[PDB]
Subunit: 55 residues, 3 copies
């Protein structure tokens, strides 16, 4: 299904920014991953959008 | 259900504080939602009450 | 269940770090318990490793 495929993508990028010692982008995709999994897809986009806009 | 009503109520306030760009409150209600959703409410009021007294 | 034993261990130390009001360590073991509860044990050790080295 689509959602567990999404759960794959967040896992790849989240681990990558944990290595770089990025505890502002690693803590963030911990939040986004939970929202996608529970079904709060709308809130996930709002949370992620500000980071992309900023950096 | 008792816990289902609580879960929606946190979502109402949580969304309201992500649009305002508040990354202290919006981050905090991510944790409080998970504490209630899992069955550890006593730790939720420990995390929640410190924000209320501070703000 | 052996994962339940790990989850109990995280609880004991997590509440031990909420009385002191340590909001660096406490928010960290929120993520670690979430990592262990789902199966991302490989990320949990890397997440917790950084805290051990500093402190
Ligand atoms: Zn991480
Ligand atoms: Zn949010
Ligand atoms: Zn806590």
């Amino acid at each position: 299904n689509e959602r567990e495929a999404l759960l794959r993508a967040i896992d790849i990028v989240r681990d990558k920014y944990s290595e770089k010692g990025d505890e502002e982008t690693d803590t963030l995709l911990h939040r986004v991953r939970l929202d996608v999994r529970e079904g709060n897809l709308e809130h996930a986009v709002e949370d992620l959008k500000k980071l992309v806009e900023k950096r």
